[PDB]
């Protein structure tokens, strides 16, 4: 009976709410109140990456925390050398519409994805010398909102088909489809150990999946708006998810509940990207206000008004070494901050 | 700098030069986006103008290249990828004039036209109103009245007046009328001049955008 199963689901929701509340003895603000605040953070524009004829949609770093891949609607996927501003590559896409770009940790591969419903994957280190597609994954009935390489062969694709997919690139099929997101998944974040990845979908709920086993482990529904970008804590037992409601809500895995919300009366433009630091003390976010307002993770206050971009900061990222912060925007420029 | 740095900087400037020539070609290569509902004459209009995911169609006409983009596939919320169509410099909406009574598909057609034209991203992209299946509407207008489609209708069951009323309602869905202008071309689904209409309308849009960029308009 649908009625009894629905009642059981409601009872399980009541049980999870009761358990979460019963485990909520004190908040993180209580613990962090008796410590010295971060204060004010001042980072300037150290260089601007010019050359994209169209607005940059996705940005990713590499393991060496030097190279930078940027995706634009001009049909070009351009890789940059951050320290010495230089366009490494200009990949002419088969479909000019790209929303996600992922630089593999090995640095040998890049990904795009968009309205073509296909994860175009390029072996940059082509024996020819140019850049050509190595595989065109065609199993997703929707746009590819976010992809993230696990290995050179495994890619997790957050798609518009309300499901994430783990792909075998050489095989071409989906080795595992992650179902459970009632809304199309916009962003996914990987744990450092690459064992459990979260997926922030449009259902105002990020889900913690087990890559190998194949099902979701915990669910977190605190947002009033869809999750556009999610980032694990450096430790990995928590994460911050950004929404279009201009509020970032930090969730702790072990308590599987909300921890803190980073919102203010001045900030109404929705968060387009979420970034932590190498220590997690600072919560960066890019909004539609063409600005990068950055928050203190421990204490709810805005510890920076970083702004150097004329248009919306669509893609925001922090290097693996934590030295710098990249802010890709729709003004066709990527700018680093220090 | 170093010889590698010098050579890489040169390759950067010359990749920039290649992108500059690509943008030169895209100065005459105009991006069109087709917006049609389920079976709204979109196939007929793409066929006439020729003479899932997305469908890309590249061509040219009197030294004016066109890249038409069909987005019928990828059914989603459309609020998370529509911003990819910021760079499109032409929009062609598609429908059928007789689609005012079956289930109402005119309601959904006007609905996504409103979501497109009155979009917080598409406040500066202009409209071409390609209509199809005009012969069925012409035959059927005298048969059944349009008052079921619009309760505020007092006109006669004539194809001219019904078409004019539907076009007034369709145009009223736009509120920012300064940056964009709606062209109209009533097609009886057999015309071969649709590509010529696209040429003239796109040239008009190029002229208007250039005037605005010159600060004159």
């Amino acid at each position: 009976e649908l009625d009894q199963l629905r009642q059981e689901a409601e009872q399980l929701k009541n049980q999870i709410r009761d358990a979460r509340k019963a485990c909520a003895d004190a908040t993180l603000s209580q613990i962090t109140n008796n410590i010295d605040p971060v204060g004010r953070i001042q980072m300037r524009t150290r260089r601007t990456l010019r050359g994209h004829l169209a607005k940059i949609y996705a940005m990713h770093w590499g393991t060496d925390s030097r190279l930078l891949v940027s995706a634009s609607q001009d049909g070009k996927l351009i890789i940059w050398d951050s320290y010495t501003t230089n366009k490494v590559h200009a990949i002419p896409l088969r479909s000019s519409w790209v929303m996600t770009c992922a630089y593999a940790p090995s640095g040998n591969y890049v990904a795009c994805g968009g309205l073509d419903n296909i994860c175009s994957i390029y072996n940059l280190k082509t024996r020819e010398g140019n850049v050509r597609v190595s595989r065109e994954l065609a199993g997703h009935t929707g746009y590819l909102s976010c992809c993230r390489f696990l290995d050179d062969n495994q890619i997790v694709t957050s798609s518009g088909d309300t499901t994430c997919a783990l792909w075998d690139i050489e095989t071409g099929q989906q080795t595992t489809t992650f179902t459970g997101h009632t809304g199309d998944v916009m962003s996914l974040s990987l744990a450092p150990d690459t064992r459990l990845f979260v997926s922030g979908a449009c259902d105002a709920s990020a889900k913690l999946w087990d890559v190998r086993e194949g099902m979701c482990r915990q669910t977190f529904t605190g947002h009033e708006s869809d999750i556009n970008a999610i980032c694990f804590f450096p430790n990995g037992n928590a994460f911050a998810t950004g929404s279009d409601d201009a509020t970032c809500r930090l969730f702790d895995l072990r308590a599987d509940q909300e921890l803190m919300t980073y919102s203010h009366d001045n900030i109404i433009c929705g968060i387009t990207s979420v970034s932590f630091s190498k220590s997690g003390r600072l919560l960066l976010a890019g909004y539609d206000d063409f600005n990068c307002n950055v928050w203190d993770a421990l204490k709810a206050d805005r510890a920076g008004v970083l702004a150097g971009h004329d248009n919306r900061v669509s893609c925001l990222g922090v290097t693996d070494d934590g030295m710098a912060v990249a802010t890709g925007s729709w003004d066709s420029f990527l700018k680093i901050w220090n | 700098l170093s010889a590698e740095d010098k050579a890489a900087v040169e390759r950067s400037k010359m990749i920039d030069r290649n992108l500059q020539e690509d943008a030169e070609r895209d100065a005459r290569t105009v991006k069109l986006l087709l917006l049609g509902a389920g079976e709204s004459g979109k196939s007929t209009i793409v066929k006439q103008m020729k003479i899932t995911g997305i469908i890309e169609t590249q061509f040219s006409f009197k030294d004016l290249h066109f890249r038409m983009f069909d987005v019928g596939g990828q059914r989603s919320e459309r609020k998370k990828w529509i911003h990819c169509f910021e760079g499109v410099t032409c929009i062609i909406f598609c429908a059928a004039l007789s689609a005012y009574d079956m289930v109402n598909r005119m309601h959904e057609s006007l609905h996504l036209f409103n979501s497109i034209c009155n979009h917080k991203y598409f406040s500066t992209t202009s409209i071409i109103l390609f209509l199809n299946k005009k012969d069925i509407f012409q035959e059927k207008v005298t048969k059944v009245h349009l008052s079921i489609c619009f309760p505020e209708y007092t006109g006669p069951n004539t194809f001219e007046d019904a078409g004019n009323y539907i076009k007034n309602q369709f145009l009223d869905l736009n509120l920012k009328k300064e940056d964009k202008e709606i062209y109209s071309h009533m097609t009886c689904a057999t015309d071969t001049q649709n590509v010529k209409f696209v040429f003239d309308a796109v040239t008009d849009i190029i002229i208007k955008e250039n005037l605005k960029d010159c600060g004159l308009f």
Partner: single-chain antibody, 232 residues
Framework: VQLVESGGGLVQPGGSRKLSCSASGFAFSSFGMHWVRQAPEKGLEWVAYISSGSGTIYYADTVKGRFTISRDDPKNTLFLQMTSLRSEDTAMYYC??????????????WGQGTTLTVSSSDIVMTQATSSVPVTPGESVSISCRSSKSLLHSNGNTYLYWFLQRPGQSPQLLIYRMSNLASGVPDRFSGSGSGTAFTLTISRLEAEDVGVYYCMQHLEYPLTFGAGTKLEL
């Protein structure tokens, strides 16, 4: 990917022999190119450089203004229009597959070559190893000191390593003195202290036989070492 060429043959000194190198397999117009000579019984020295479409052309002191090298990007062919040949110009020219970005692998592919024969303040680098008997299954660290420190503000040490097998063309082994080129076995690695530059190779096989050239990329009048031959 191929780098076939033209030209060659007995050309009188003082004349004008044009070498055309056409490539089928990769993007000629978006990937730079070079010209490195090699005498029949001598080493290899860089002759001229052409950007991916002749942006800036650089010459050696012995070919400065004397040559005129260009290319046809639509024709996928690289043209070496060379004038006023001499006795020291007879050398086997490689239209080098050279690309230039960060972590790039320039000089990755060298073409089959076309030997051209004629009728009768640089960063000098040292390859004092000369001849070394390499035994299979043994780790080899081979050195090439630089006259000028190869470090830079960006910190990249511009030293290269190339493998010249008998009858074949050089292929890049180690680029930027530390990184490993694609298609090279992982038994090669690169490390250096700024001047003394050690190329670490472990458990060598017959595929490594040949000579090893250390190339810098600081000041564009590039230098190559004499080339230490590695034979069992």
């Amino acid at each position: 990917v191929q780098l076939v060429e033209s030209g060659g043959g007995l050309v009188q000194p003082g004349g004008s022999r044009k070498l055309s190198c056409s490539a089928s397999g990769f993007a000629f117009s978006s990937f730079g190119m070079h010209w490195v000579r090699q005498a029949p019984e001598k080493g290899l020295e860089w002759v001229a450089y052409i950007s991916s479409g002749s942006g800036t052309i650089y010459y050696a002191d012995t070919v400065k203004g004397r040559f005129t090298i260009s290319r046809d990007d639509p024709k996928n062919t690289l043209f070496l229009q060379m004038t006023s040949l001499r006795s020291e110009d007879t050398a086997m020219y490689y239209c080098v597959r050279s690309i230039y970005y960060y972590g790039s692998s320039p000089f990755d592919f060298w073409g089959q070559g076309t030997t051209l024969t004629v009728s009768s303040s640089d960063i000098v680098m040292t390859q004092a190893t000369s001849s070394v008997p390499v035994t299979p299954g043994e780790s080899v660290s081979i050195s090439c000191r630089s006259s000028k420190s190869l470090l830079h503000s960006n910190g990249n040490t511009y030293l290269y390593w190339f493998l010249q097998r008998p009858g074949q063309s050089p292929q890049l082994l180690i680029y930027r003195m530390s990184n490993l080129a694609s298609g090279v076995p992982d038994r090669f690695s690169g490390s250096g202290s700024g001047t003394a530059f050690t190329l670490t190779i472990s458990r060598l096989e017959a595929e490594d036989v040949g000579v090893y050239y250390c190339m810098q990329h600081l000041e564009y009048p590039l230098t190559f070492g004499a080339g230490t031959k590695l034979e069992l």
